[PDB]
Amino acid sequence: SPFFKVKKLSEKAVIPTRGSPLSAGYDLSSAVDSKVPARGKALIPTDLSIAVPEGTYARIAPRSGLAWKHSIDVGAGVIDADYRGPVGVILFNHSDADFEVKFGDRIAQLIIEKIVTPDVVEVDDLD
Amino acid sequence: PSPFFKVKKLSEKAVIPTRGSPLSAGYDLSSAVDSKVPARGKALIPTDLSIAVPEGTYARIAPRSGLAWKHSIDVGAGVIDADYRGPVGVILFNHSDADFEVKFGDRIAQLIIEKIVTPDVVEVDDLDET
Amino acid sequence: SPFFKVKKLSEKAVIPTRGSPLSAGYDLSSAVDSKVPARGKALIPTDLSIAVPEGTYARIAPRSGLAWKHSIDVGAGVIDADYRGPVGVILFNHSDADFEVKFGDRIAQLIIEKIVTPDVVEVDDLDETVR
Ligand SMILES: [Mg+2]
């Protein structure tokens, strides 16, 4: 049975919520105030640790508003189901304008994507 | 219930998205406009479509491989919720020093209906060790 | 039942491996020495061809380390389940420093994501949603 368990690592953390009833993702909020330099990057802590089920992973996905309005998008973003460290969001600034993330800003959305993980079979012929 | 992909044309310029091979992941998205993605910049390209995909999925607007190598084009963000009924636009980022020209009808992205789970969020005191 | 078939196209190829029992991705290694130029791009060969099952595709996904240490992101990355050509990794460099790729370096990770591929139908109107 699917689950999404979240542990607050500080009092500043915001428990993720979905934005609409059928929404794909859980909104993630910044636990800090941080500059994202023009044509540069920032690593934004959520002060959360998580667990998601085997047969899935948590993808840190971009919010469309951040991307369209501010040319900000998300690098990396693959959180394994057994990763128990703090969840941070890597933002890339694809513009010549400096940007600033404020404490509590929603900076990404977490999507729990279904996957398969079979053992690899090496072959001489794929078909 | 069986999966579905319904599309509604918002103008005559919209093109029904079509897959590219019988096992292909995604449905090709065509531009409804003439436009451009400026060098080192971005654009929102209308498809003039509204869509519906099933609960337990979302529609991901994903980059085409050819455009990524030839024009350094990427999709800046492409999460479309299963309950999103607004117009579908494609956000393109141009990671090169030359403009990318868009003519109406041009394929600019592909849509992939990804399976997900959406359980309730549960705050906990401790997580298991791995 | 899911599978992941891999064919090596040369001796330089490395069978993709998963790091831990619950890891999402299979690490992909470069088959070449190469460079991703500052603010530029490169197509890095793996010298692999692959097959994944119907109802999935293989997503070429970024490694977190390369993203943060080198501003490297993966472009493109949608590998169809019936694509039988060579698998190359498209890297974008979002920094002003060249990124060197050495033979055997891990440059991405492959994730076999579950999808649906229903027959698309045009309709006159869609349901409006409480949103
Ligand atoms: Mg995905």
Numbering used by the authors:
A (entry chain C): 26 to 152
B (entry chain B): 25 to 154
C (entry chain A): 26 to 156
Quote the passages of the study that discuss this structure, keeping the authors' original sentences:
Deoxyuridine triphosphate nucleotidohydrolase (dUTPase; EC 3.6.1.23) is an important enzyme that prevents uracil misincorporation during de novo DNA synthesis. It catalyzes the hydrolysis of dUTP to deoxyuridine monophosphate (dUMP) and inorganic pyrophosphate, thereby maintaining an appropriate level of dUTP with respect to deoxythymidine triphosphate (dTTP) levels. We found that Arabidopsis dUTPase contains a unique tryptophan at the 93rd position, which is located between motifs 2 and 3.
When the active sites of both the apo and holo forms are superimposed, all of the apo active sites have three water molecules at similar locations as those commonly found in the holo form. These data suggest that the coordination of these water molecules is necessary for initial ligand binding at the active site. In the apo form, all of the tryptophan 93 side-chain coordinates were oriented upwards; thus, all of the tryptophan 93 Nε1 atoms were located away from the serine 89 Oγ.
